[PDB]
DNA sequence: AAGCGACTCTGGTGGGACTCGAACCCACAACCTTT
């Protein structure tokens, strides 16, 4: 127990786990990531066909302009103007606080950061999916199979000198004919190489490997080129939204050779890559409750077939009936990849040992849950709830030990609404969560090797990032015509006097007492939240929601000298290894 | 052909573990479940008219105490467990805290005391003529169970307890020169001492010739412990050896025994399949029995390491029509496929052929069963598909042809968690669960066991007439199909009667008289148990006549052995003169062989009476009648149906069908009647217990 | 069913309250199907040895002597008009031999009614050695303890006697629902009327008896009929 | 003093079991009800 106050204004015993998590995450990645994997799966220019304007029109999300919004920033003078931005466009970063907002044309339902090796200093990208229509909503029990666009957004390099005046750039998108995308996961490491890598004209330097959980019941795997390598091949006069039709590296689907009998598994709902080198397994969760594993390198004629176009179709090597109801979320253990956790709409969290799938390590029945996060250093998992079964005033976010330490669930944050999405920063040891209330909070977990019951006042460990309010001005147009989004942003520069600052009072008056609104579209609701996995930009967060606006925030108060210390030493090591 | 049989069997607890349904040679069906093993005992009930399957239900309780694998001193292990859990390395600490092998119980961990796997021994392994049950919990307690009385299973031995001590006494070294006494405080050696004794799966050998049976236990590290049990198995006393062979197979998933005969030369091995895909037969290089011998060198059946886990193995003896020799067919479930391999000894040695029969299922195969008499395979997946898969001989090796059986048509939309097949292929038993209802999930889950007829009555009747095994108890599942028909139609189908009379005329061995007695007793039950009264009296007269015939044949055989061994002048345990009088009592049967045998005996018999006495009186019992003896005071003593001695003891043995009674053997009995008292019941071939 | 098993079955068809020796002979004499032996005094010693030598049977001394059984026969089974009437013809409702006192929440899981369950003492090791050899004759046992000698079958035997061979031993029942089933069991061929169970056996709301009876119907351990009680009023009452 | 980690002390809700209130049903006597 370390006394005194950090310069960011949190007590040192509250910040001390955050500082420890930097070393533990670095030591893990040195041992269990790798610099290059899947050396065959590299992008080819002839596999990327640019759509004309007439061909792209079915795929673009249908709203051409955002809702009107204004952003108020704690302690600054009031803006008072209303912004509105075109689809595939961004406002400029605020000069002091570097928050960026951009619009994707539809409600955001998948989002991931492109992972980049430590010290690389690369350009940072997010891949996301926003549904074609703001008001259409899809059943779980049915395969959708419609069109959709996978969007790749560059955020800049997010260096301090780069952030003032930064803007998000829509670098390209892939027109998919595979329905909506319910999850996105990049290969955790070894997928990225320098954009300057000399490669022969058919080949392109590789930006990442991206797996898509499609609403038509299959997983699609893409290898992504760096944008400049495409634009060098692209005609110079081409249409400025670069929409491509792209061949998969592989399509991953449940079945067997010559087994014409279509699988009952239904829609693919969630993904997890194998966290550890060589990342050779990918898992998915299905609507029927099965968890399904594909052995990505597999040569075996019983699992791999090559289609006439040259793409692979991969059948799984292992499947088991994890849940008695739709398995909504997976997390695969980083510290030892024999273990995986899943949660399903039977409202059980089940821990698995993949060597022994016949019985879970531990089943805990809980409230219905939307997403899980497994922070590397902690044996348990933090859970986001759908509120529909929680006791009023006890709904929120819980950390749950996997069971050996035997602690009770730790109530990290009360929330009134359903938390739609959750993301744990391994580098920060903090967690961020988005609510149908339209509020984004962050919370610092205690060191969960130690019994949480001593955490006598958890509210000192959480803070809001922003809240979206509808201000008057059941369907999108009737809502947009009569409301605008007031985004209220916290001063994340420091947490001094936190519990007396108005954003905390506003949040604390939200918790427990505020009543959910059901006579509207929920236009303020936040659907995905993602901390950066990269050591560069480790303190950055991205979020998006029903508005189809996507917002980026730097949590300046949790960035720290050890992160700078580690970024520079990693820069030196990287610059020595690659030149 | 496939239709449901009427009783669904409700299960109180969740079905649990690997490949959870099995059907023993003893017609007891076990389902391994989270709180017990439920055992369903199929009785061809001759005392009731109900057309259902008469399923007697028993269970093995789950253990009350969690099992800790011994890896060191009680204090030495405790300081090590503290060291690992407190470790600041995420990998070491979380590897310890997540793996349930190191943590069989905890403060907030559910106890893993339900059953992982179960295997049925061959018949004749129990202290009675019955089979033993090997049962494995998920906390790695391996136990052998028997049902000595009918009501309650008792644990005969815990094999994990013994093996843990025998490893500890050798410091966890198999060869004492080969390794150091590595420090338990090293996580690799700590994990090893757990891994080297965590049982995956186990299987019984056939009966080795005094009888013996092996049990091979597969461990996570690829060791196999081959236990040898002396028979009848009564506990730790009967464990003749334990020997560990190092398979070296990484992550071994499944085990089965290979036993085979060519030119009357016996051979055997263990076939072992990895979770990572390959399949290999080990030569069992170590054994003590002299009559068997073992394969000379390992053969690789599948080498690919494709990581399709070998979930199940079965094999069946066959005779190949074109190679004109006996061969062994191996079938193994590998993901959603069935691997098959045919093993054929010839002048070239082993000739081997293999393939994957493909397109069976769109999900992994959750269970597999082999029809031992035909090699018909059944395979199943949790989408509720079951596929019948028929081996068809090819000029060399085989082809497999297969067809779905529509469980949808008999049970509706259903999930299937396991299948089993009756020893003659008469029934398929299925663990059904509520299926997806038009794409919706079922709200509530309730496991059941359900049965479907695999064979028509006409095929069951024909196969019983042409039965090579000629014991009814080996065929309870076929005579149950015959029973169902007779109870349904209240008459014996004429072609079966005519064919049976032809067999009794042309062969007349007591098997056919036993088969006649079964049909007539089920007929009597069918007709509501005064033309009906006249018909009841007529057929009851026929039952009594054939029941009397079977009695004379047994009495003749008993006296036809009293004559062969040394004459028991003290008349010690057989009412010899009473039986002679009973056989001579009528001239109605002309069999001179009996009439001269009782002549030779009565010439040799003592003039001293040596009568049987009623223990409540010390007064004679006259031997008036087959079933029971009486005295002037009016006491009634049943007679042992194997030896006709009166069952005056406070405990005696009763047939599975209660149709017949037998005495317990005593130390005063000579060996030859101690062997005679092990005969099955003369009327129904069921165990007399 | 075998004679030796029919003895142990009858001992197990009384509940946890068990039998006195004179009650046991009365139960065997009234058995259907008939008991095979003549039940002579020498036979009673033989059957007594069959109890003492059986490890599941157990013996207790209760604080007070139990009443002897009535003639249980419930039904008239005659008429003067055409046919016969098998309506209930009421015996005198004398003091019940087996008043309901449910053994709730037992840590060993044994269940049933017994008014003295906490008060009676085991005398198994007085009646037999731990090697199951009988230490007393029947006449010595009845001389020493009289009606205070109580014979009880093990829970496994008692529950088996309620469910038969086709029944599933894994099924736990609530204590009140088990005590309904046990109250049926000791009635043998002439089951209790549901009217009488709630009115005078359990002394509860008819809603309570129905509710606790539900599980026995759901698992199918009991069979339901409408039946007729001929009152001294001459009118006759419907009951289950 | 100011601070910490067990150890309590205090209002609030759900899980399964169970009280609750209702209509429904027997079989009889009353007789209204009919040629
Ligand atoms: Zn006598
Ligand atoms: Zn018999």
Residue numbers in the entry:
A (entry chain C): 290 to 762, 785 to 890
B (entry chain B): 50 to 258, 271 to 590, 663 to 822
C (entry chain A): 1 to 240
Original paper wording:
TFIIIC is composed of two subcomplexes, τA and τB, that bind two gene internal DNA motifs: A-box and B-box. τA binds the A-box with low affinity and is required to recruit TFIIIB to the promoter DNA. τB interacts with the B-box with high affinity and, therefore, is essential for target DNA recognition of type 2 genes. hTFIIIC consists of τA subunits TFIIIC35, TFIIIC63, and TFIIIC102 and τB subunits TFIIIC90, TFIIIC110, and TFIIIC220. TFIIIC220 forms an integral part of both τA and τB connecting the two subcomplexes via a ~550–amino acid residue flexible linker.
The cryo-EM structure of DNA-bound human τB enabled us to unveil the molecular basis of B-box DNA recognition. The 3.2-Å cryo-EM map of DNA-bound τB was of sufficient quality to assign 35 bp (55 to 89) of the DNA sequence. TFIIIC dimerization is likely to be concentration dependent because our MP measurements did not show clear indications for dimer formation at nanomolar concentrations. The observation that TFIIIC dimerizes under cryo-EM conditions should be treated with care because we were unable to evaluate TFIIIC110 dimerization in solution due to a limited amount of protein sample. Because TFIIIC also functions in 3D genome organization, one could, nevertheless, speculate that DNA-bound τB dimerizes at tRNA gene clusters and ETC sites, where it may help to stabilize long-range chromatin loops.
